[PDB]
């Protein structure tokens, strides 16, 4: 009757957030973003994106780590797979590209849980946790994974981002602030048995 996955959390103070050079967005605007999505859809079909959910606690209060692009949009660490690239190897590659250390020591990323799937039916902002009616060729498939952190780690944050620890209550019913994926993380994380180490 214990059917829940057990996840170890560690205090935010166990982690060191260093700095490294800016990591520039491939798209300089929303219009460039959907232009490139259109171009690549014609060459290699549906975009495949992967996102990592990294959890910490402070005083037993779970927090999700978010990347804030300056003081603008909040992002999960992640990004686009190459054609034929494994989803889990790819999320590990991307999380290394974003948060990997300047001394080039490897993080031991542990990824054992899928926490959801989102689909983009058009070259437009809307995303859904299912393929909408009549949609045969979704333009993007986004996969979210829970990333189990080690007890301690050094992360190097690109200088153009802030790493922010968001408490679940701040995400919950806050789509305007965070959008539909991040704002549904409280619900999607509720099934886990978190251990507060
Ligand atoms: C922009 C574009 C295409 C992308 O989405 N993924 C790559 C290929 C690599 C990357 C991942 N990030 C990033 C993602 C989330 C938070 C912070 C940084 N910025 N670049 C890109 O460059
Ligand atoms: Zn405490
Ligand atoms: Zn799909």
Curated annotation (Swiss-Prot):
Keywords annotated in UniProt: Acetylation, Cytoplasm, Differentiation, Methylation, mRNA processing, Nucleus, Phosphoprotein, RNA-binding
Record's subcellular location: Nucleus; Cytoplasm
UniProt cross-references to PROSITE patterns, sorted A to Z: NUDIX
Protein name: Cleavage and polyadenylation specificity factor subunit 5
Positions of region (Necessary for interactions with PAPOLA and PABPN1): 51-130
Substitution effect: residue 73 to A: Reduces affinity for UGUA RNA by 99%
UniProt record similarity statement: Belongs to the Nudix hydrolase family. CPSF5 subfamily.
Gene behind the chain: NUDT21
């Amino acid at each position: 009757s214990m059917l829940e996955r057990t996840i170890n959390l560690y205090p935010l103070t166990n982690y060191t957030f260093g700095t490294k050079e800016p990591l520039y967005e491939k798209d300089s605007s929303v219009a460039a973003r959907f232009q490139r999505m259109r171009e690549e859809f014609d060459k290699i079909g549906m975009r495949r994106t992967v996102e990592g959910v990294l959890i910490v606690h402070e005083h037993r209060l779970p927090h999700v780590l978010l990347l804030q692009l300056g003081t603008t949009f909040f992002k999960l660490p992640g990004g686009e797979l190459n054609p034929g690239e494994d989803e889990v190897e790819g999320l590990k590659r991307l999380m290394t590209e974003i948060l990997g250390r300047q001394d080039g020591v490897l993080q031991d990323w542990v990824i054992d849980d899928c926490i959801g799937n989102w689909w983009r039916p058009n070259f437009e902002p809307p995303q859904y946790p299912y393929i909408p009616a009549h949609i045969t060729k979704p333009k993007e498939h986004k996969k979210l994974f829970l990333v189990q952190l080690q007890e301690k780690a050094l992360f190097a944050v690109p200088k153009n981002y802030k790493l922010v620890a968001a408490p679940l209550f701040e995400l919950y019913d806050n789509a305007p602030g965070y959008g539909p994926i991040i704002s549904s993380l409280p619900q999607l994380l509720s099934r886990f048995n978190f251990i507060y180490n």
